[PDB]
Amino acid sequence: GGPSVFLFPPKPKDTLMISRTPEVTCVVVDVSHEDPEVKFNWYVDGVEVHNAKTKPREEQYNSTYRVVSVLTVLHQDWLNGKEYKCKVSNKALPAPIEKTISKAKGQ
C-alpha cells in the first residue's frame, strides 16, 4: 500500500475548443502526515516539462493527505496522441511511482 498515484485525461470538450484549457491531472493519495512532501516530475513524449502546478495538500478522512498536480496541455499535443507521464516521489516510497496516459491508451 502506502501512497498511490492516479492520472486523469483532460475533459474531452476542453481539447476541442481552443478557448478552453485542457489539463492532465495527477492525484496522489494516502500521503502520510510523517512524510507529507511529494515531488512531481512530468514528461511529454519523454521530454520533461516544468509548467505543472501543485495544489495544496488536503487532509482526508483517514488522516492522510491527498496531493494533486495539474499540467496544462497543448490541445494539438493531446489530440495527436502525445504521451503524458507523471512521476511521483515521496519518502515512504521505496522508489518513485510513474503513470502514463495518452488519448490512445491512458491508464
Side-chain angles (χ1 to χ4, degrees):
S4 293
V5 181
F6 302 98
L7 193 55
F8 305 86
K11 296 183 178 68
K13 254 56 175 300
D14 288 342
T15 72
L16 301 175
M17 296 167 211
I18 200 73
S19 70
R20 316 263 278 180
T21 310
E23 323 169 316
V24 168
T25 308
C26 196
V27 184
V28 183
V29 303
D30 294 346
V31 177
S32 76
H33 281 161
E34 319 78 63
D35 292 293
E37 178 160 49
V38 181
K39 182 174 176 287
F40 294 89
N41 288 91
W42 289 86
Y43 310 82
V44 180
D45 263 6
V47 176
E48 166 163 38
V49 296
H50 306 89
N51 59 303
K53 298 291 188 306
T54 307
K55 293 192 191 173
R57 67 183 58 145
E58 184 168 56
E59 189 49 36
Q60 301 296 311
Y61 164 84
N62 64 332
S63 297
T64 61
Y65 292 123
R66 190 168 178 277
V67 178
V68 180
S69 176
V70 180
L71 179 78
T72 307
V73 306
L74 198 69
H75 304 75
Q76 314 69 359
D77 276 6
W78 177 265
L79 296 169
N80 284 164
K82 288 211 168 195
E83 191 171 291
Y84 297 78
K85 171 187 294 185
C86 172
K87 184 180 300 182
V88 173
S89 295
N90 175 261
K91 253 298 184 187
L93 293 182
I97 293 178
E98 55 193 311
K99 304 296 290 191
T100 64
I101 186 168
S102 71
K103 185 171 182 177
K105 42 195 76 181
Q107 302 309 318

